[PDB]
Amino acid sequence: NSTSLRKMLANPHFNAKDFVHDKLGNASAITID
Amino acid sequence: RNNVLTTLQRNIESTLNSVASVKDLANEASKYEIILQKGINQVGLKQYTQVVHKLDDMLEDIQSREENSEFHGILTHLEQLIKRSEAQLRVYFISILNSI
């Protein structure tokens, strides 16, 4: 969901950049690639 | 549209590395001990200074991470290459600013 994730979350960094490593941070490094 | 760059592409281009991994920054930071140890005039203005934004911005979310050994070693390699770069900068400042 790079529209929702990329557009809607971290394009203006609202919310912060570490929560993407936290709220989406459970063994999903394939989806981070 | 300059605001579309300056708001969306600004913090988008900032939060590119919102999560980014641990070893790769050591790899390309070491490749910035390749390129940052090529001098200034070989490398060039926003080439050199923007690579300083790449280690500046590679020391970036690591305060946001956690304490392993690669954390401290990459803090050493990063910040000492940073101050090598900064010394080289002010050297070049003074180098032309009494070229008169």
UniProtKB/Swiss-Prot annotation, chain A:
Highest taxon of the lineage: Eukaryota
Signal sequence interval, chain numbering: none
Location of this chain's protein in the cell: Cytoplasmic vesicle, Secretory vesicle; Bud; Bud neck
Function description: Involved in the secretory pathway as part of the exocyst complex which tethers secretory vesicles to the sites of exocytosis. Plays a role in both the assembly of the exocyst and the polarization of this complex to specific sites of the plasma membrane for exocytosis and to the budding site. Also involved in assembly of the spliceosome.
Assembly and oligomerization: Component of the exocyst complex composed of SEC3, SEC5, SEC6, SEC8, SEC10, SEC15, EXO70 and EXO84. Also interacts with SNP1.
Assigned protein family: Belongs to the EXO84 family.
Protein's recorded name: Exocyst complex component EXO84
Native source organism of the sequence: Saccharomyces cerevisiae (strain ATCC 204508 / S288c) (Baker's yeast)
Parent sequence residues shown: 169 to 201 of 753
From Swiss-Prot, chain B:
Subcellular locations according to the entry: Cytoplasmic vesicle, Secretory vesicle; Bud; Bud neck
Domain of life: Eukaryota
Protein family per UniProt: Belongs to the EXO70 family.
Known partners and oligomeric status: The exocyst complex is composed of SEC3, SEC5, SEC6, SEC8, SEC10, SEC15, EXO70 and EXO84. Interacts with RHO3.
Role, per record: Involved in the secretory pathway as part of the exocyst complex which tethers secretory vesicles to the sites of exocytosis. Plays a role in the assembly of the exocyst.
Note: Present with 4280 molecules/cell in log phase SD medium.
Protein name: Exocyst complex component EXO70
Naturally occurring in which organism (per UniProt): Saccharomyces cerevisiae (strain ATCC 204508 / S288c)
Residues of the full protein shown: 53 to 156 of 623
